[PDB]
């Protein structure tokens, strides 16, 4: 419990931890109620629920879209304006690269952030609150909940997809999110920076206003059960930086308390 | 109906411009608002937006803490008001309007009303 009071003043900022331990159910807690702007973690709950109401062959079918529906950040997108890409693909890019079009594009077909908050409450997540699109949602003054979550909400509902019990998904598309989330190229410096070698993991990373830096994750022991973790942070001054070392170090603290 | 773009043209580098943009046929003042930009050879890039209750405004990073978005209800106009003109701001800016929040403020695809564009040279 200190010893994440310490990490805060190290990097003058402020930390949202929750882990569970799917084995044991041993939790790990600090400002686990406290809201924090989701950022780009959304995007793992975003395909969590395109994976409910779409097949594996219905994830097959190409989305056709132009230059007017590119934003601010399209490292995969911009390179398919001419052919569009299948939801699978358009998921590998918000997943693995944090491409924020192919986002945009997910969420319009699952109906847009409003239908992403129904299909949160229904899996039994009260406190996510999508409301804007990327990057717009990224915007998130201290005070506000449009576009925030919590630690403890954002690691049941990323269980609840993931995860076999309580199994919110059949086996092969818990597959399929775990394989994506498993090769991010975005998160090498913050929980897998924390665990030690030769644990599995599958995260997703998020940045926002006011220094927010995130990380979202499913790590798995050489042998055994799973631990799932959110490590979300923030700053004062709206145009905070952020440093990736806090969240590698909360990991960290975490891991010493969970063994 | 149509959204007529003024206030742009020669202008000097450090220099101030109040682009005006116009609302003809209906009322905009429900409308969530915008503007683009696009240089010759450039992409067509989001510059602002701003919505019609609160009047949350939104700038690009390229353009942030520069440019300042408002509104007139009663004269049917936006303004965009360009403070410390660069000469990466010289573009063609487009005056954008959409009734309701259908997508991203930064994707063109959202905007079902488009003006003529006005040039800006710095």
């Known amino acids: 419990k200190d010893d994440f009071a310490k990490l805060e003043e190290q990097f003058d900022a402020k930390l949202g931890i929750f882990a569970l331990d799917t084995g044991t159910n041993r939790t790990v807690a600090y400002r686990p109620d406290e809201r924090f702007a989701f950022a780009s973690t959304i995007k793992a709950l975003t395909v969590g629920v395109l994976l409910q109401q779409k097949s594996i062959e219905d994830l097959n079918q190409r989305i056709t879209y132009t230059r007017d529906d590119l934003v601010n950040y399209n490292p995969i997108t911009e390179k398919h304006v001419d052919t569009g890409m299948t939801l699978k693909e358009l998921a590998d890019a918000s997943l693995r690269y944090s491409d924020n079009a192919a986002q945009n594009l997910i969420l319009k077909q699952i109906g847009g952030p409003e239908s992403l908050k129904k299909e949160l409450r229904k899996i039994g997540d009260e406190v996510t609150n999508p409301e804007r699109f990327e990057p717009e949602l990224n915007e998130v003054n201290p005070g506000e909940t449009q576009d925030t979550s919590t630690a403890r909400a954002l690691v049941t509902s990323l269980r609840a997809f993931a995860l076999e019990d309580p199994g919110k998904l059949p086996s092969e598309k818990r597959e399929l999110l775990i394989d994506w989330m498993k090769r991010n190229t975005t998160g090498d410096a913050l929980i897998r920076a924390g665990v030690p070698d030769g644990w599995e993991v599958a995260d997703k990373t998020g940045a926002a206003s006011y220094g927010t830096r995130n990380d979202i994750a499913i790590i798995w022991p050489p042998k055994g059960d799973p631990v799932v973790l959110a490590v979300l942070s923030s700053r004062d001054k709206k145009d905070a930086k952020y440093d990736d070392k806090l969240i590698a170090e909360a990991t960290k603290v975490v891991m010493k308390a969970l063994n | 109906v149509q959204l007529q773009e003024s206030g742009g043209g020669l202008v000097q580098a450090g220099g101030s411009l109040r682009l005006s943009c116009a609302a003809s046929?209906?009322?905009?003042?429900?409308?969530?608002m915008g503007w683009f930009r696009k240089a010759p050879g450039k992409e067509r890039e989001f510059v602002a937006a701003?919505?019609?209750?609160?009047?949350?405004?939104y700038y690009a990073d390229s353009v942030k803490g520069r440019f300042a978005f408002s509104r007139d209800n009663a004269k049917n106009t936006v303004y965009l008001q360009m403070n410390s003109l660069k000469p990466e701001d010289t573009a063609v800016y487009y005056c954008?309007?959409?009734?309701?929040?259908?997508?991203?403020?930064?994707?063109?695809?959202?905007?079902?009303?488009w003006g003529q564009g006005t040039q800006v040279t710095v």
């Open positions: 701003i919505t019609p209750g609160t009047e949350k405004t």
């Open positions: 954008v309007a959409t009734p309701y929040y259908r997508g991203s403020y930064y994707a063109a695809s959202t905007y079902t009303y």
């Open positions: 046929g209906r009322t905009f003042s429900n409308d969530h």
